[PDB]
Homo-oligomer: A and B are copies of this chain.
Amino acid sequence: AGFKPAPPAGQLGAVIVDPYGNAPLTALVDLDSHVISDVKVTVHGKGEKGVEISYPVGQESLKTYDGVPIFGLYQKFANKVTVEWKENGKVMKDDYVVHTSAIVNNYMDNRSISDLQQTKVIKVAPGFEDRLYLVNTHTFTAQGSDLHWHGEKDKNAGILDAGPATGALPFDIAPFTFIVDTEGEYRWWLDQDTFYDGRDRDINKRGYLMGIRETPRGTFTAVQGQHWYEFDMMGQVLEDHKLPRGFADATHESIETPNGTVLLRVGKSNYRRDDGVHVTTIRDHILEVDKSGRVVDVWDLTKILDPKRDALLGALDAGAVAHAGQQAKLEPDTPFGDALGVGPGRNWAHVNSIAYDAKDDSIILSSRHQGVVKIGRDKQVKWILAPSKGWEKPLASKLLKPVDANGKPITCNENGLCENSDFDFTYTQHTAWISSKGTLTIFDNGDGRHLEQPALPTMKYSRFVEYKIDEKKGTVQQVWEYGKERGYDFYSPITSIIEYQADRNTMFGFGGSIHLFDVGQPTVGKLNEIDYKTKEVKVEIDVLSDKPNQTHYRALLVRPQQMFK
User: Residues on A close to B: CB < 8 A?
Assistant: 1-7, 9, 14-21, 24, 30-33, 60, 63-67, 76, 78, 96, 98-106, 108-116, 140-150, 153, 158-165, 169-170, 172-173, 193, 199-204, 217, 219, 226, 230, 238-240, 244-247, 260, 270-272, 290-298, 318, 321, 323, 326, 328-331, 333-335, 337-341
Contacts and interface: CB of A to CB of B under 8 A. Distances in A.
Chain copies in the assembled complex: 3
18 contacts: A2-B170, A6-B140, A6-B142, A21-B106, A24-B106, A60-B296, A65-B246, A76-B102, A76-B115, A99-B114, A101-B102, A101-B104, A101-B106, A102-B103, A148-B149, A158-B339, A160-B334, A165-B165
A79 to B, nearest CB: 11
B64 A244 contact: yes
A27 to B, nearest CB: 8
A207 to B, nearest CB: 11
B1 A153 contact: yes
Contacts of A230: 292
Contact of A244 (B66, B103, B247): B66
B323 A159 contact: yes
Contact of A272 (B9, B32, B104, B158): B32
Contacts of A246: 31, 63, 65-66
A2 to B, nearest CB: 3
| Chain B CB within 10 Å, residue with most, of A114, A148, A162, A272 | A162
A200 B226 CA distance: 11
B328 A160 contact: yes
A486 to B, nearest CB: 29
A74 to B, nearest CB: 12
A153 B330 CA distance: 18
A467 to B, nearest CB: 32
A333 B14 CA distance: 30
Contacts of A318: 159-160
A259 B19 CA distance: 29
A145 B150 contact: yes
Contacts of A109: 6, 14-17
Contact of A294 (B64, B114, B245): B64
Contacts of A99: 108, 112-115
B17 A60 contact: no
A271 B66 CA distance: 11
A65 B160 contact: no
Contacts of A339: 158, 160-162
A321 to B, nearest CB: 8
A340 to B, nearest CB: 5
A161 B230 CA distance: 34
Nearest to A333: B158
B110 A64 contact: no
| Chain B CB within 10 Å, residue with most, of A76, A147, A296, A337 | A147
Closest 8 CB pairs of A and B: A66-B246, A2-B145, A102-B102, A162-B337, A1-B163, A148-B148, A33-B272, A291-B291
Contacts of A3: 140-141, 144-145, 170, 172-173
A391 B270 CA distance: 45
A348 B295 CA distance: 44
A448 to B, nearest CB: 14
